[PDB]
Protein backbone atom coordinates (compact mmCIF):
# COMPACT_ATOMS: atom_id res chain seq x y z
CA UNK A 1 0.00 0.00 0.00
CA UNK A 2 2.11 2.50 0.91
CA UNK A 3 5.29 1.06 -0.38
CA UNK A 4 5.39 -1.94 -2.35
CA UNK A 5 8.81 -3.42 -3.76
CA UNK A 6 7.16 -6.64 -3.98
CA UNK A 7 5.79 -9.44 -7.04
CA UNK A 8 2.95 -9.22 -5.96
CA UNK A 9 -0.45 -11.08 -7.45
CA UNK A 10 -3.71 -9.89 -6.24
CA UNK A 11 -6.83 -10.78 -7.19
CA UNK A 12 -6.11 -13.04 -10.82
CA UNK A 13 -7.21 -16.15 -11.30
CA UNK A 14 -5.06 -18.85 -13.24
CA UNK A 15 -4.06 -21.83 -15.00
CA UNK A 16 -8.30 -22.10 -15.33
CA UNK A 17 -8.29 -25.69 -18.19
CA UNK A 18 -10.53 -27.83 -18.87
CA UNK A 19 -10.16 -30.82 -21.43
CA UNK A 20 -13.14 -33.20 -23.28
CA UNK A 21 -13.32 -35.82 -25.41
CA UNK A 22 -16.50 -36.89 -26.07
CA UNK A 23 -19.33 -35.25 -24.12
CA UNK A 24 -23.29 -35.23 -25.11
CA UNK A 25 -24.72 -32.90 -22.74
CA UNK A 26 -28.35 -31.70 -23.30
CA UNK A 27 -29.23 -29.13 -21.12
CA UNK A 28 -32.88 -27.91 -21.44
CA UNK A 29 -33.23 -24.74 -19.32
CA UNK A 30 -36.69 -23.54 -18.88
CA UNK A 31 -36.43 -20.51 -16.51
CA UNK A 32 -33.32 -18.97 -14.81
CA UNK A 33 -29.89 -19.50 -15.35
CA UNK A 34 -27.72 -22.10 -16.15
CA UNK A 35 -24.12 -22.81 -16.65
CA UNK A 36 -21.99 -25.42 -17.97
CA UNK A 37 -18.27 -24.29 -19.01
CA UNK A 38 -16.13 -21.71 -17.25
CA UNK A 39 -16.84 -18.66 -15.77
CA UNK A 40 -13.63 -16.43 -14.46
CA UNK A 41 -14.34 -13.67 -12.31
CA UNK A 42 -11.23 -10.93 -11.08
CA UNK A 43 -11.72 -7.24 -9.78
CA UNK A 44 -11.00 -5.00 -7.07
CA UNK A 45 -12.26 -2.12 -6.14
CA UNK A 46 -12.03 0.71 -3.49
CA UNK A 47 -15.32 0.79 -1.91
CA UNK A 48 -18.48 -1.24 -3.00
CA UNK A 49 -17.91 -4.46 -4.91
CA UNK A 50 -20.21 -6.76 -6.61
CA UNK A 51 -19.34 -10.25 -8.83
CA UNK A 52 -22.23 -12.10 -8.60
CA UNK A 53 -21.62 -14.56 -10.97
CA UNK A 54 -24.11 -17.46 -12.28
CA UNK A 55 -27.34 -16.32 -10.14
CA UNK A 56 -30.47 -15.89 -11.18
CA UNK A 57 -34.04 -14.12 -9.36
CA UNK A 58 -37.38 -15.45 -9.90
CA UNK A 59 -39.30 -13.08 -7.49
CA UNK A 60 -42.92 -12.98 -8.82
CA UNK B 1 0.17 -2.66 3.95
CA UNK B 2 2.54 0.23 5.15
CA UNK B 3 5.43 -1.85 3.95
CA UNK B 4 5.91 -4.68 1.28
CA UNK B 5 9.12 -5.96 -0.02
CA UNK B 6 7.41 -9.67 -0.21
CA UNK B 7 6.57 -12.04 -3.37
CA UNK B 8 2.74 -11.60 -2.12
CA UNK B 9 0.20 -13.81 -3.73
CA UNK B 10 -3.09 -12.46 -2.40
CA UNK B 11 -6.64 -13.34 -3.11
CA UNK B 12 -6.04 -15.48 -6.09
CA UNK B 13 -7.43 -18.88 -8.05
CA UNK B 14 -4.49 -20.67 -9.16
CA UNK B 15 -4.32 -24.27 -11.05
CA UNK B 16 -8.07 -25.01 -11.42
CA UNK B 17 -8.02 -27.93 -13.92
CA UNK B 18 -10.80 -30.32 -15.46
CA UNK B 19 -10.64 -33.23 -18.05
CA UNK B 20 -13.45 -35.08 -19.03
CA UNK B 21 -13.50 -38.69 -21.27
CA UNK B 22 -17.49 -39.75 -22.15
CA UNK B 23 -19.60 -37.66 -19.86
CA UNK B 24 -23.51 -37.82 -20.81
CA UNK B 25 -25.33 -35.07 -18.51
CA UNK B 26 -28.94 -34.45 -19.40
CA UNK B 27 -29.61 -31.51 -16.94
CA UNK B 28 -33.52 -30.37 -17.03
CA UNK B 29 -33.87 -27.54 -14.47
CA UNK B 30 -37.01 -25.91 -14.46
CA UNK B 31 -35.99 -22.99 -12.39
CA UNK B 32 -33.72 -21.28 -10.19
CA UNK B 33 -30.35 -21.65 -10.69
CA UNK B 34 -28.15 -24.66 -12.06
CA UNK B 35 -24.06 -25.14 -12.25
CA UNK B 36 -22.46 -27.92 -14.34
CA UNK B 37 -19.07 -26.69 -14.16
CA UNK B 38 -16.23 -24.57 -13.62
CA UNK B 39 -16.37 -21.30 -11.67
CA UNK B 40 -13.34 -19.30 -10.30
CA UNK B 41 -14.17 -15.28 -8.73
CA UNK B 42 -11.30 -13.60 -7.48
CA UNK B 43 -11.88 -10.19 -6.07
CA UNK B 44 -11.00 -7.60 -3.21
CA UNK B 45 -12.25 -4.60 -2.07
CA UNK B 46 -12.07 -2.12 0.92
CA UNK B 47 -15.34 -1.66 2.32
CA UNK B 48 -18.26 -3.85 0.92
CA UNK B 49 -17.95 -7.43 -0.99
CA UNK B 50 -20.35 -9.62 -2.93
CA UNK B 51 -18.40 -12.73 -4.25
CA UNK B 52 -22.64 -14.16 -4.88
CA UNK B 53 -21.54 -17.53 -6.96
CA UNK B 54 -23.93 -19.64 -8.00
CA UNK B 55 -27.17 -18.37 -5.95
CA UNK B 56 -30.91 -18.32 -6.65
CA UNK B 57 -33.04 -16.13 -5.12
CA UNK B 58 -37.08 -17.89 -5.09
CA UNK B 59 -39.37 -15.10 -3.43
CA UNK B 60 -42.99 -14.96 -4.22
CA UNK C 1 1.01 -5.89 8.13
CA UNK C 2 2.84 -2.93 8.94
CA UNK C 3 6.36 -4.81 7.53
CA UNK C 4 6.45 -7.63 5.42
CA UNK C 5 9.47 -9.23 3.78
CA UNK C 6 8.38 -12.79 3.06
CA UNK C 7 6.32 -14.73 0.96
CA UNK C 8 3.12 -14.44 1.75
CA UNK C 9 0.44 -16.48 0.36
CA UNK C 10 -3.12 -15.45 1.03
CA UNK C 11 -6.91 -15.90 0.73
CA UNK C 12 -5.40 -18.56 -2.54
CA UNK C 13 -7.09 -21.67 -3.76
CA UNK C 14 -4.70 -23.35 -5.03
CA UNK C 15 -4.37 -27.05 -6.99
CA UNK C 16 -7.79 -27.75 -7.47
CA UNK C 17 -8.63 -30.49 -10.18
CA UNK C 18 -10.79 -33.15 -11.28
CA UNK C 19 -11.24 -36.21 -13.34
CA UNK C 20 -14.45 -37.84 -15.25
CA UNK C 21 -14.22 -41.17 -17.51
CA UNK C 22 -17.54 -41.95 -18.16
CA UNK C 23 -20.38 -40.15 -16.10
CA UNK C 24 -23.72 -40.33 -17.00
CA UNK C 25 -25.72 -37.30 -14.12
CA UNK C 26 -29.67 -36.43 -14.97
CA UNK C 27 -30.28 -33.55 -12.60
CA UNK C 28 -33.59 -32.75 -13.06
CA UNK C 29 -33.61 -29.36 -10.92
CA UNK C 30 -37.00 -28.06 -10.22
CA UNK C 31 -36.42 -24.96 -7.79
CA UNK C 32 -33.36 -23.67 -6.07
CA UNK C 33 -29.76 -23.74 -7.13
CA UNK C 34 -27.60 -27.11 -7.94
CA UNK C 35 -24.27 -27.11 -8.20
CA UNK C 36 -22.30 -30.61 -9.83
CA UNK C 37 -19.00 -29.80 -10.50
CA UNK C 38 -15.95 -27.17 -9.43
CA UNK C 39 -16.47 -23.25 -7.73
CA UNK C 40 -13.59 -21.69 -6.21
CA UNK C 41 -14.51 -18.22 -4.30
CA UNK C 42 -11.27 -16.34 -2.81
CA UNK C 43 -11.68 -12.71 -1.98
CA UNK C 44 -10.58 -10.35 0.70
CA UNK C 45 -12.08 -7.19 2.45
CA UNK C 46 -11.40 -4.31 4.83
CA UNK C 47 -14.89 -4.21 6.27
CA UNK C 48 -17.85 -6.69 4.99
CA UNK C 49 -17.59 -10.10 3.28
CA UNK C 50 -19.76 -11.82 0.97
CA UNK C 51 -18.35 -15.27 -0.44
CA UNK C 52 -21.80 -16.53 -0.12
CA UNK C 53 -21.72 -19.54 -2.67
CA UNK C 54 -24.12 -22.28 -3.68
CA UNK C 55 -26.67 -20.93 -1.80
CA UNK C 56 -30.85 -20.66 -2.20
CA UNK C 57 -33.64 -18.85 -1.19
CA UNK C 58 -37.30 -19.91 -0.99
CA UNK C 59 -39.40 -17.38 0.98
CA UNK C 60 -43.13 -17.27 0.49
CA UNK D 1 -10.67 -63.53 -34.65
CA UNK D 2 -12.51 -65.16 -36.89
CA UNK D 3 -15.27 -62.86 -36.34
CA UNK D 4 -15.65 -59.77 -34.15
CA UNK D 5 -18.64 -57.66 -33.29
CA UNK D 6 -17.80 -56.09 -30.01
CA UNK D 7 -15.93 -53.08 -28.84
CA UNK D 8 -12.41 -54.73 -28.64
CA UNK D 9 -10.04 -53.05 -26.99
CA UNK D 10 -6.79 -54.28 -27.26
CA UNK D 11 -2.84 -53.63 -26.09
CA UNK D 12 -4.33 -50.22 -24.93
CA UNK D 13 -2.39 -47.99 -22.81
CA UNK D 14 -4.76 -45.44 -21.11
CA UNK D 15 -5.20 -43.13 -18.69
CA UNK D 16 -1.52 -42.59 -17.61
CA UNK D 17 -1.03 -39.17 -15.77
CA UNK D 18 1.64 -37.28 -13.14
CA UNK D 19 1.60 -34.20 -11.75
CA UNK D 20 4.38 -32.41 -9.62
CA UNK D 21 4.44 -29.10 -7.75
CA UNK D 22 8.11 -28.85 -6.22
CA UNK D 23 10.64 -31.17 -6.99
CA UNK D 24 14.43 -31.60 -6.96
CA UNK D 25 15.86 -34.17 -8.32
CA UNK D 26 19.74 -33.76 -9.26
CA UNK D 27 20.23 -37.80 -11.29
CA UNK D 28 23.80 -37.60 -12.43
CA UNK D 29 24.35 -40.79 -14.43
CA UNK D 30 27.87 -42.16 -15.45
CA UNK D 31 26.58 -44.89 -17.26
CA UNK D 32 23.42 -47.70 -17.98
CA UNK D 33 20.12 -46.01 -18.47
CA UNK D 34 18.20 -44.18 -15.92
CA UNK D 35 14.44 -43.45 -16.62
CA UNK D 36 12.97 -40.76 -14.04
CA UNK D 37 9.24 -39.80 -16.18
CA UNK D 38 7.03 -41.70 -18.26
CA UNK D 39 7.03 -44.04 -20.87
CA UNK D 40 4.16 -46.11 -22.48
CA UNK D 41 4.47 -48.76 -24.94
CA UNK D 42 1.66 -50.73 -27.07
CA UNK D 43 2.49 -53.03 -29.53
CA UNK D 44 1.28 -56.42 -30.97
CA UNK D 45 2.75 -58.39 -33.59
CA UNK D 46 1.74 -61.98 -35.56
CA UNK D 47 5.54 -63.99 -34.63
CA UNK D 48 8.46 -62.10 -32.69
CA UNK D 49 8.29 -59.29 -30.25
CA UNK D 50 9.88 -57.00 -28.50
CA UNK D 51 9.23 -54.00 -26.34
CA UNK D 52 12.29 -54.10 -24.03
CA UNK D 53 12.06 -50.80 -22.87
CA UNK D 54 14.20 -49.11 -19.73
CA UNK D 55 17.21 -51.53 -20.11
CA UNK D 56 20.82 -51.19 -20.15
CA UNK D 57 23.75 -53.32 -21.34
CA UNK D 58 27.19 -53.31 -20.18
CA UNK D 59 29.27 -56.48 -21.48
CA UNK D 60 32.65 -55.47 -21.36
CA UNK E 1 -9.49 -60.56 -38.80
CA UNK E 2 -11.58 -62.56 -41.29
CA UNK E 3 -14.45 -60.48 -40.10
CA UNK E 4 -14.58 -57.34 -38.05
CA UNK E 5 -17.29 -55.43 -37.54
CA UNK E 6 -16.30 -53.52 -34.32
CA UNK E 7 -15.12 -50.27 -32.78
CA UNK E 8 -11.53 -51.47 -32.02
CA UNK E 9 -9.18 -49.81 -30.70
CA UNK E 10 -6.22 -51.75 -30.76
CA UNK E 11 -2.47 -51.05 -29.88
CA UNK E 12 -2.98 -47.31 -29.21
CA UNK E 13 -1.73 -45.28 -26.30
CA UNK E 14 -4.52 -42.78 -25.47
CA UNK E 15 -4.66 -39.93 -22.42
CA UNK E 16 -1.45 -40.26 -21.43
CA UNK E 17 -0.71 -36.10 -19.45
CA UNK E 18 1.66 -34.47 -17.21
CA UNK E 19 1.44 -31.42 -15.30
CA UNK E 20 4.45 -29.47 -13.57
CA UNK E 21 4.34 -26.23 -11.21
CA UNK E 22 8.51 -25.52 -9.84
CA UNK E 23 10.77 -28.52 -10.79
CA UNK E 24 14.53 -28.07 -10.87
CA UNK E 25 16.02 -31.18 -12.18
CA UNK E 26 19.60 -31.44 -12.63
CA UNK E 27 20.32 -34.12 -14.64
CA UNK E 28 24.36 -34.60 -15.59
CA UNK E 29 24.26 -37.74 -17.90
CA UNK E 30 28.06 -38.45 -18.22
CA UNK E 31 26.95 -41.82 -20.06
CA UNK E 32 24.54 -43.84 -21.42
CA UNK E 33 20.80 -43.02 -22.21
CA UNK E 34 18.68 -40.91 -19.41
CA UNK E 35 15.23 -40.02 -20.15
CA UNK E 36 13.00 -37.65 -18.07
CA UNK E 37 9.88 -37.32 -19.28
CA UNK E 38 6.75 -38.80 -21.53
CA UNK E 39 7.78 -41.36 -24.55
CA UNK E 40 5.24 -43.07 -26.15
CA UNK E 41 5.12 -45.78 -28.64
CA UNK E 42 2.51 -47.58 -30.62
CA UNK E 43 3.48 -49.94 -33.41
CA UNK E 44 2.33 -53.35 -34.95
CA UNK E 45 3.63 -56.12 -37.63
CA UNK E 46 3.06 -59.11 -38.78
CA UNK E 47 6.53 -60.69 -38.38
CA UNK E 48 9.40 -59.10 -36.21
CA UNK E 49 9.14 -56.50 -33.83
CA UNK E 50 10.95 -53.96 -31.99
CA UNK E 51 9.86 -51.30 -29.53
CA UNK E 52 13.03 -51.02 -27.96
CA UNK E 53 12.41 -47.38 -26.09
CA UNK E 54 15.12 -45.78 -23.31
CA UNK E 55 17.86 -48.63 -23.63
CA UNK E 56 21.38 -48.35 -23.87
CA UNK E 57 24.17 -50.15 -24.65
CA UNK E 58 27.72 -50.28 -23.68
CA UNK E 59 29.53 -53.46 -25.34
CA UNK E 60 33.76 -52.70 -25.35
CA UNK F 1 -8.36 -57.92 -42.23
CA UNK F 2 -10.42 -59.89 -44.74
CA UNK F 3 -13.63 -58.07 -44.02
CA UNK F 4 -13.62 -54.90 -42.02
CA UNK F 5 -16.99 -52.81 -41.54
CA UNK F 6 -15.79 -51.19 -38.45
CA UNK F 7 -14.53 -48.18 -36.94
CA UNK F 8 -10.73 -49.43 -35.90
CA UNK F 9 -8.16 -46.90 -34.21
CA UNK F 10 -4.89 -48.83 -34.85
CA UNK F 11 -1.49 -47.98 -33.59
CA UNK F 12 -2.62 -44.39 -32.92
CA UNK F 13 -1.01 -41.86 -30.24
CA UNK F 14 -4.15 -40.16 -28.53
CA UNK F 15 -4.15 -37.44 -25.89
CA UNK F 16 -0.86 -37.14 -25.11
CA UNK F 17 -0.05 -33.87 -22.95
CA UNK F 18 1.68 -31.66 -21.02
CA UNK F 19 2.17 -28.75 -18.88
CA UNK F 20 4.59 -26.16 -17.22
CA UNK F 21 4.95 -23.49 -15.00
CA UNK F 22 8.62 -22.47 -14.08
CA UNK F 23 10.63 -25.34 -14.78
CA UNK F 24 14.67 -24.78 -14.30
CA UNK F 25 16.51 -27.82 -15.88
CA UNK F 26 19.88 -27.31 -16.62
CA UNK F 27 20.54 -31.22 -18.40
CA UNK F 28 23.99 -31.30 -19.04
CA UNK F 29 24.83 -34.49 -21.20
CA UNK F 30 28.22 -35.45 -22.19
CA UNK F 31 27.84 -38.78 -23.56
CA UNK F 32 24.68 -40.50 -25.59
CA UNK F 33 21.25 -39.59 -25.49
CA UNK F 34 19.22 -37.14 -23.04
CA UNK F 35 15.62 -36.32 -23.73
CA UNK F 36 13.56 -34.58 -22.02
CA UNK F 37 9.95 -33.92 -23.32
CA UNK F 38 7.82 -35.88 -25.39
CA UNK F 39 8.39 -38.83 -28.52
CA UNK F 40 5.40 -40.20 -29.66
CA UNK F 41 5.68 -42.70 -32.22
CA UNK F 42 2.97 -44.79 -34.75
CA UNK F 43 4.32 -46.79 -36.90
CA UNK F 44 2.93 -49.96 -38.94
CA UNK F 45 4.41 -52.46 -41.27
CA UNK F 46 3.59 -56.01 -43.23
CA UNK F 47 7.33 -58.02 -42.28
CA UNK F 48 10.09 -56.30 -40.31
CA UNK F 49 9.58 -53.07 -37.76
CA UNK F 50 11.74 -50.87 -35.88
CA UNK F 51 10.98 -47.74 -33.66
CA UNK F 52 14.04 -47.76 -31.39
CA UNK F 53 13.16 -44.31 -29.81
CA UNK F 54 15.46 -42.71 -27.01
CA UNK F 55 18.34 -44.98 -27.38
CA UNK F 56 21.98 -45.08 -27.87
CA UNK F 57 24.96 -47.12 -28.34
CA UNK F 58 28.60 -46.61 -26.86
CA UNK F 59 30.64 -49.45 -28.61
CA UNK F 60 34.56 -48.71 -28.18
Known sequence: ???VGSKTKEGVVHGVATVAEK???QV???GGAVVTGVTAVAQK???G???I???TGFVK
Open 28 to 30: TNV
Open 49 to 51: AGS
Open 1 to 3: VLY
Open 23 to 25: TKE
Open 45 to 47: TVE
Open 53 to 55: AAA
